[PDB]
Symmetry: D2
């Protein structure tokens, strides 16, 4: 499966895809083809693109999932922290993450202070579980940089809205990174639609600079 690594331990993997560029074409005609996709994209006939659908498997920090899951025109199924024992996996920003901000302490110490809290919080979590505290309560001490996993099924129209909002400099850098991988898979599977999207409908800044 197309699997792209994101952040220190994250990823976006493509589980499944229904259709391709021609799925939008046939829906539009209800039945020259590449010019029809450009045409549709240029004039804002977005509905035929709903007949292309993807399922992704995504491993992401909770603070990224939280932003992602705001996209309501999609289907999600996520790892359960109430009944599963949660794995020791946390997003630790690289020193380069703080490139462009003037800091009081070196970026290696910032990375160290994050790692410190993470380790303290996880130990506590494990101590609570061992003492017979239910997992659903014990987990509340875990930080927002804990990794979670989920399935995401989303059609090309909603995906393009996701890319307008997340493959953009105003989105938090971490989700941008996920959106770039989504765009990469989208492009591999639906090249005509992806290029037409960038040319006529894409509202973000980064995908027109990041090849």
């Amino acid at each position: 499966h197309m699997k792209i690594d994101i952040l220190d331990k994250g990823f976006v993997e493509l589980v499944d895809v229904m259709g391709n560029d021609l799925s939008a074409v046939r829906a539009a005609r209800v039945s020259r083809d590449r010019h029809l996709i450009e045409y549709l994209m240029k004039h804002g006939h977005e509905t035929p693109f709903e007949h292309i659908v993807f399922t992704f498997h995504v491993k992401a920090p909770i603070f990224v999932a939280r932003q992602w899951f705001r996209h309501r025109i999609a289907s999600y199924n996520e790892l359960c922290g109430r009944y599963s024992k949660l794995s020791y996996e946390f997003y630790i920003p690289s020193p380069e993450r703080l490139e462009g901000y003037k800091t009081t302490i070196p970026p290696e110490r910032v990375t160290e202070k994050i790692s410190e809290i993470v380790d303290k919080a996880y130990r506590t979590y494990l101590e609570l579980i061992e003492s017979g505290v239910p997992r659903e309560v014990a987990r509340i001490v875990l930080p927002l940089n804990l990794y979670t996993r989920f399935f995401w099924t989303v059609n090309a129209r909603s995906l393009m809205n996701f890319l307008n909002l997340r493959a953009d400099s105003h989105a938090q850098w971490e989700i941008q990174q996920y959106a770039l991988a989504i765009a990469r898979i989208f492009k591999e599977k639906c090249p005509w639609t992806f290029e037409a999207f960038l040319k006529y409908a894409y509202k973000g800044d980064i995908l027109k600079e990041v090849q």
Copy 2:
């Protein structure tokens, strides 16, 4: 894959595409038989979100009065033949005499059927005449009756599909869309046998499946 079921006199439901299978729900429930048991468990308890990861595209030819009921299902995608821009074909649902089974009628069912054909023919000829006169199609078509056939593509996931079958695969629904819902059910069954059996066994609220 590909399946086509003919409905009414000139209608059809055709399966254009599918994403996933019964294991797509299982994979999703688990974020990846014990697997068949899981599908039944999900169905039994109304854990329906996993079934959203199974997706169908259908191509449907149905009368307008059927499509109008159908398109009330908002959790889906539609693209439909455009009467504003295309010259519309002479195809109309004429009920067979058997459609009036049960109903004691004043005129024999054949005459009912013939009365329907005649008004339809008259409406269509007027439509054509207006078009020949230079009347925009979007105006001319307003004389056409609700039994005119339209075509559309329908993309729907298994969860929304089960909602559709609950409502339309049911005696309280009009006979004509019931017939379509039976074709939708048969294709669903072919492609997702486990989910469909579990559905019928545990979740299905209608009465004709």
Copy 3:
């Protein structure tokens, strides 16, 4: 508030939850610089705050119009049942002025007449079928697409602006354009700041800038 549309149609306001401040409260999560914030939300595509303004309309429209209208899925509908009601002798007959700009072979007043004729013969066939013991749900299939229907429509400001982007526009059928113009006027009356910022920043259609 009620606006008559076409020959026998209308759009009336049944209810509204909120006003421009409803969006402001939502965007701030609390409870002019308020009006600056509405324009800020609109200019930047921060549309979700407007979802917390909600209208309910009562609309009487021909079925062909209602079918275009009912394509707008992010809203709630309840329509008159034709399966069990005796349907009312009301049909949209176009004015002769409806064919202005079109050079036709028969007079526009004659087009109008041919439309009423069919309406009348169709309705009479329907009544004949009903009187014969044909169930209404079968008899009504002979009725033309210009038959008037009624529905309740509950829609939020955001979905309403989408609707006006697509329907308050010359590419939409004139008939639904007229209805969209009425929706816009009721929208403007209830939420003038949002309506004004919408027109300035986000509105994609053409006719609301003309009329």
Copy 4:
């Protein structure tokens, strides 16, 4: 109408469009108590749910992130939440009472569970603040914050999607914390739409708690 939930949370009613009769008028498409109340029961009993979509609520809700993350899986509703990338997060966190763990056999007194939870919260928060003073951006500084951090949001939901919410959350299979919130949602729905809430419970409600707990 504002109801306190948990230790620092609440459900507050911001607005409402309609009442029981808004569903009746939608169902009839038309702009008599016993007749109207009968209609509501008939709709609910026969699963004609769509008329209830014409009633709509806006809540202001303050809840811990682990609760918000469950809630926000309800996609047929509208949401605006306070922003952690750009606001300085307030020192407010949910600390379970010892009574939250009564009837779990634990190796330590539930008071020590509270102290343990409270301890990490303080550390995480202190680290967060430490990072902010350093010039680390908030969007990054907050990732050390635990899942019991309180958040606030606006929720706009129609009575239909609200009743779904209650079936699933006003139910003992949902996490106890969200149950508490759902009972508050339910009491407010009941106050504003008594006939629909009662018909709902008699005919349509699949949860277990609203039939045992009054309001």
